[PDB]
Amino acid sequence: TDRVSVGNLRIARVLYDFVNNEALPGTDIDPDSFWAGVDKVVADLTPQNQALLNARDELQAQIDKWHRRRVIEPIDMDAYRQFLTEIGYLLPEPDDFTITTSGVDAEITTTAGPQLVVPVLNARFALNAANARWGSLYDALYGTDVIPETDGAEKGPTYNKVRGDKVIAYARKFLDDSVPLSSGSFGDATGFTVQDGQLVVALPDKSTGLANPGQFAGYTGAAESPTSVLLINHGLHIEILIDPESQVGTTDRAGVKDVILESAITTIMDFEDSVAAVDAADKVLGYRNWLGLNKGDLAARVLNRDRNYTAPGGGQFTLPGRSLMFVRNVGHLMTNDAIVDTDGSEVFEGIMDALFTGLIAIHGLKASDVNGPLINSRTGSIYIVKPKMHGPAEVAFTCELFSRVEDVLGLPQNTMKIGIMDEERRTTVNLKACIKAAADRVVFINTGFLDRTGDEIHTSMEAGPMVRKGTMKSQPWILAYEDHNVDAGLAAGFSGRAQVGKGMWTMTELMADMVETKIAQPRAGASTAWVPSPTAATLHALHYHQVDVAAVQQGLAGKRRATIEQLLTIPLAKELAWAPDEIREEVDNNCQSILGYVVRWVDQGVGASKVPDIHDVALMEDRATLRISSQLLANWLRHGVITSADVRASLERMAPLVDRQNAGDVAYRPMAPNFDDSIAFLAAQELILSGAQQPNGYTEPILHRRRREFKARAAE
Ligand SMILES: O=C(O)c1cc(F)c(Cl)cc1Cl
Ligand SMILES: [Mg+2]
Ligand SMILES: [Mg+2]
Ligand SMILES: [Mg+2]
Numbered sequence: 001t002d003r004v005s006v007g008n009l010r011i012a013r014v015l016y017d018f019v020n021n022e023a024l025p026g027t028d029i030d031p032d033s034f035w036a037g038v039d040k041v042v043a044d045l046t047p048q049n050q051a052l053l054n055a056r057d058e059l060q061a062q063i064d065k066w067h068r069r070r071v072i073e074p075i076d077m078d079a080y081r082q083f084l085t086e087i088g089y090l091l092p093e094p095d096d097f098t099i100t101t102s103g104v105d106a107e108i109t110t111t112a113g114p115q116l117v118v119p120v121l122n123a124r125f126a127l128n129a130a131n132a133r134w135g136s137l138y139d140a141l142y143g144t145d146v147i148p149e150t151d152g153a154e155k156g157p158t159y160n161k162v163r164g165d166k167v168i169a170y171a172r173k174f175l176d177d178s179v180p181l182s183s184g185s186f187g188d189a190t191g192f193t194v195q196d197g198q199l200v201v202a203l204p205d206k207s208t209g210l211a212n213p214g215q216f217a218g219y220t221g222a223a224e225s226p227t228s229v230l231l232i233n234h235g236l237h238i239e240i241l242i243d244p245e246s247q248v249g250t251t252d253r254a255g256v257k258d259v260i261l262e263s264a265i266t267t268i269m270d271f272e273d274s275v276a277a278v279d280a281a282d283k284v285l286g287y288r289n290w291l292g293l294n295k296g297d298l299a300a301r302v303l304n305r306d307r308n309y310t311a312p313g314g315g316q317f318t319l320p321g322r323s324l325m326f327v328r329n330v331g332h333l334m335t336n337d338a339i340v341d342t343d344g345s346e347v348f349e350g351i352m353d354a355l356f357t358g359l360i361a362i363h364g365l366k367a368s369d370v371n372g373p374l375i376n377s378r379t380g381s382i383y384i385v386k387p388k389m390h391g392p393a394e395v396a397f398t399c400e401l402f403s404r405v406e407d408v409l410g411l412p413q414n415t416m417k418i419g420i421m422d423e424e425r426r427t428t429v430n431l432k433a434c435i436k437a438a439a440d441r442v443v444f445i446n447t448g449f450l451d452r453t454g455d456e457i458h459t460s461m462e463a464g465p466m467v468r469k470g471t472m473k474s475q476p477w478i479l480a481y482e483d484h485n486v487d488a489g490l491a492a493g494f495s496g497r498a499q500v501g502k503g504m505w506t507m508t509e510l511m512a513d514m515v516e517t518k519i520a521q522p523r524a525g526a527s528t529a530w531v532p533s534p535t536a537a538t539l540h541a542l543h544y545h546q547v548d549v550a551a552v553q554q555g556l557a558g559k560r561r562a563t564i565e566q567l568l569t570i571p572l573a574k575e576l577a578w579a580p581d582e583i584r585e586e587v588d589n590n591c592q593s594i595l596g597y598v599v600r601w602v603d604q605g606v607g608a609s610k611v612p613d614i615h616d617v618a619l620m621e622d623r624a625t626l627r628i629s630s631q632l633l634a635n636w637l638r639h640g641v642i643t644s645a646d647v648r649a650s651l652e653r654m655a656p657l658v659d660r661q662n663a664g665d666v667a668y669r670p671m672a673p674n675f676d677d678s679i680a681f682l683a684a685q686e687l688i689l690s691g692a693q694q695p696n697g698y699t700e701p702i703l704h705r706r707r708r709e710f711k712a713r714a715a716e
Helices: 013-023 031-068 077-086 123-133 137-142 161-178 280-295 349-365 392-409 431-437 449-459 476-491 511-517 534-546 549-556 580-604 624-638 644-661 679-689 700-714
Strands: 003-006 009-012 115-119 134-136 191-195 198-202 216-222 225-233 236-242 256-262 266-270 307-310 316-319 324-328 335-341 346-348 382-386 416-422 442-447 499-502 528-531
Touching: 003 013, 003 031, 009 013, 009 031, 013 280, 013 349, 031 077, 031 346, 031 349, 031 392, 031 449, 115 123, 123 134, 123 266, 123 280, 123 534, 134 137, 134 534, 137 161, 137 256, 137 534, 161 236, 161 256, 161 534, 191 225, 236 534, 256 534, 266 280, 280 324, 280 335, 280 349, 324 349, 335 349, 346 349, 349 382, 349 392, 382 392, 382 442, 392 416, 392 431, 416 431, 431 442, 431 476, 442 476, 442 528, 449 476, 449 624, 476 499, 476 549, 511 534, 528 534, 580 624, 580 644, 580 679, 580 700, 624 644, 624 679, 644 679, 679 700
Parallel strands: 115 266, 115 528, 266 324, 324 382, 382 416, 416 442, 442 499, 499 528
Antiparallel strands: 003 009, 009 335, 134 256, 191 198, 216 225, 216 307, 225 236, 236 256, 307 316, 335 346
């Protein structure tokens, strides 16, 4: 082979080289000592890693048997709850505590606003996301359906003044709602000046300042004739750009060219569910991008620099031009043959990710010629989101892993902070303890609701048929799950200390709907929530101007809005819930969902994209959509809702539709009609028919295998 031997490990040459030639230089870490650390950490932590996975299996078998061993139709909750306690699934709740995590940037502790997640393997998207800290409100309004395309404001191949004027009006209104004038409206402004460190806004008949002069943060250009005016509200910046000479400015009553919102305050560069990375070459491509981001020299076109302003008084000052970056590592389950041992066994991927993404992150703490010019964390922290954990022992293990990595890296202990995903049932019902296990490292918790639903289905697979996928988002268990997560964070002292986050808006083209409905998230006390794009970050930023999250959080303090019984309410369908046409509809829906995603993943190594659903609505989901759909169909198969012929026929009907939906794609290769020849189609089928047998319903073992199979076929 072409592997490098280091103790018990045999490292893929492409990885070894990348680390030696690209990652290590500038860190001052001894290369032979680094690799020695890797071998040691992998040797030391692998058994515990394996033990935790086996414990998941042990637990699930007992739940399976408990369900199968009874006939009693409605679930006896008292008995169910004491059973879960007995087997160590439901652990005792620790006493009240407050997190002690320190050295955390203000973007995480304090500022509430949109959080962007992007696939790290896409250099363009990662670059765009990093730059999405600031975004044009006008572009976001003009370019989406937030402004209706009425029989008067329809987007053409060129600028529509009717549409533009509506964009302007909408933004003027946002200004009045967010930074009110002491009298009158921004809609009647005729100019801006800075007089005696005070913002002066010219009306037709008077001048006025702001109701709160403190919202005035600064300006650019001459105070007599500002080029722009900087404002602030709920910790987020708003910039009014002034340019009468501009295409839009000339039509504007105050010469305003645009309104810029501070949008994506933080971004998560994702190595997990939004990417397809099944071997060393794929991991390296991701590691190299994360490196470029942390050095500040990634280009594909370049990262933005910080923003220069003049304080109201006259001093200069500067603001971050880039989103503060987290990285999301893979979780505890998978191995990757990037490194194998002597036996040829693959090394745990989560362990590797912590070592390599952690090493790379050192560059984001420095600014030089070898380290690149750009800084990520000014406070000295590295932010790692850790997905798919099941319970406090698994959280503890990640923290011990980070400690071991810190030692290998020569970093202070607790440099490596943890963003805890609450997306598995055993974490949900033990959340307070999971937080305690990371009490000196935790910088967020977040409800990963799609993975969570997949776990919900798989955990109770033997209980009975589940409700339909669309119904899941309004079931009692998930609404309690959402409220419980906020309760736990706040009680652990997250306000002012750590983010409380909610899930991804997936309908990329439904921006009107997003602006209308996603406001529920900060209203529920989430200091952040996920958006899929810079445009969506800008629009979701509107919500944080309308909702005072800090005040909302203050008011939820001390309240306990979900019981353990509510969390434990399994989403079983009532008897005779569905007509046969509705059953067929749900099957087709889920099969299309699986095919649509699996085809891009297996054939093109794409893990996130705009996939049209069965009704051609554009969704940008990640691998979790596969977990839910495959588990639901497996559940329906298992309890006799549908037959194996039903499933095959739906896959066979949905496949040509998926093909057609991908018609504008040069590299696309159709699944229909030779289904046994399509690795993609068979992967889809395998996810379903083997669904009930996958550990906690996880799709990676099958997906990875099938993607590796596709790459191997392609290589000849
Ligand atoms: O929920 C997630 O983990 C997620 C992450 C992503 F990066 C994207 Cl594009 C979509 C989702 Cl649904
Ligand atoms: Mg740097
Ligand atoms: Mg997830
Ligand atoms: Mg307010």
